[PDB]
């Protein structure tokens with residue numbers, strides 16, 4: 336970047352809020368993925384939406400790529416500056432506004448995390464349910480189309496984003512459903528909100544998200560259930576869903592994952608393929624749900640439920656930190672991930688096959704997953720210097736993605752495409768799907784400067 340351009344950035348946001356220092360750029364050049372750190376040419380922290388718009392307009396008109404940056408917890412290289420440019424760290428805009436408890440809605444800026452929102456909401460009787468394990472930017476979660484353990488009951492980001500404020504690549508300000516609007520449903524025009532959820536910073540910069548809030552459950556029960564086999568745990572999951580038990584959380588850990596979590600959390604669960612379960616209801620609807628869920632797990636060899644405020648928090652903290660538990664197995668490893676999602680009836684086939692394929696290869700791997708959605712992740716731990724191992728693990732991940740596609744599923748349930756799944760996406764939606772997505776990309780970002788090299 337020229338020094339005139341850098342001074343122009345400083346004129347917008349203030350000198351302390353622009354950095355061209357290599358260390359600062361390198362910290363913003365990677366996420367949690369394997370994709371090589373590619374440092375942006377500068378990092379900029381806008382302090383308000385007007386500044387976001389002016390930074391975007393300056394970059395766009397000068398041919399400088401723009402990389403939106405939330406909390407940098409993505410796992411597909413979304414923030415990697417493959418073509419250089421300006422990384423826009425959005426987290427100084429950290430205000431919660433327009434809290435409408437009577438309407439179950441709130442507006443959050445990119446610096447607001449789920450933990451901050453739910454802390455702000457304690458005593459309200461409301462909470463925000465979509466819970467990635469990282470305390471991520473809520474606007475980043477809208478950008479990636481995130482889900483979480485609670486999504487099986489309470490929906491994904493797509494289900495819970497009511498409106499978005501978006502700075503388009505050339506700086507124009509768009510309120511996807513209209514400025515200030517919030518409602519339960521609409522047929523008014525084309526739904527623009529859904530287009531920007533899961534856009535990963537390639538269509539514009541989300542500067543606020545209007546979120547659906549949910550009533551806190553009357554009563555909560557959590558438990559773990561150990562199984563003799565992966566087949567037994569996943570058959571139980573499918574049968575629980577087919578019986579329409581409205582479980583709040585249903586999470587799978589294979590024996591490898593469970594052992595890693597034990598070692599990283601001082602849980603001490605039996606080392607076995609395991610379901611972490613949570614139920615929400617009145618003290619008596621719970622008794623009904625438990626009754627019927629235990630009957631199904633018992634049919635498949637599940638243990639009697641090991642019951643879990645403080646022990647349940649411990650349970651879900653261990654689950655949320657599964658990524659770090661797996662990385663801690665061999666210190667220094669980074670890791671590759673998968674994220675397939677299949678029709679639920681095909682979930683037993685693909686999980687059992689994945690476990691078998693992990694055994695049959697040199698590969699080390701742990702399995703954890705939002706199986707209530709038909710979704711799971713492989714965590715594939717690698718040496719950052721062993722190029723041969725990385726080639727095998729990438730080949731494994733691509734084969735797993737293609738197997739999910741063969742079953743009618745999707746290559747990513749929640750993490751997104753970034754740099755890692757672009758070729759799988761082309762196979763998933765085919766030539767007319769690819770061209771259609773590209774046409775939408777081109778009308779919003781004619782110059783191709785909005786997070787280039789990602790998704791498409």
Ligand SMILES: Cc1cc2nc3c(=O)[nH]c(=O)nc-3n(C[C@H](O)[C@H](O)[C@H](O)COP(=O)(O)OP(=O)(O)OC[C@H]3O[C@@H](n4cnc5c(N)ncnc54)[C@H](O)[C@@H]3O)c2cc1C
Pocket residue numbers: 366367402403404405406407408409410412413414425445466467468469471472473474475476477478479480481482483484535536537539540541542655656657658659749750786789
């Ligand atoms: C331990 C751990 C557990 C996780 N668990 C889950 C899980 O259960 N479910 C799940 O879905 N993900 C999960 N993730 C992945 C990650 O937390 C989510 O993808 C999250 O939504 C990323 O948010 P972020 O702000 O950190 O993203 P970043 O890495 O900062 O950015 C991700 C992508 O979105 C873009 N972007 C970010 N902010 C904006 C914005 N305001 N406007 C436009 N584009 C933007 C970036 O350009 C990039 O392409 C987990 C990650 C970790 C490390």
Ligand SMILES: CC(C)C[C@@H](O)C(=O)O
Pocket residue numbers: 410468654655657658672673703704705712713714
């Ligand atoms: C970090 C991801 C590979 C796993 C994450 O999505 C989770 O469900 O804990």
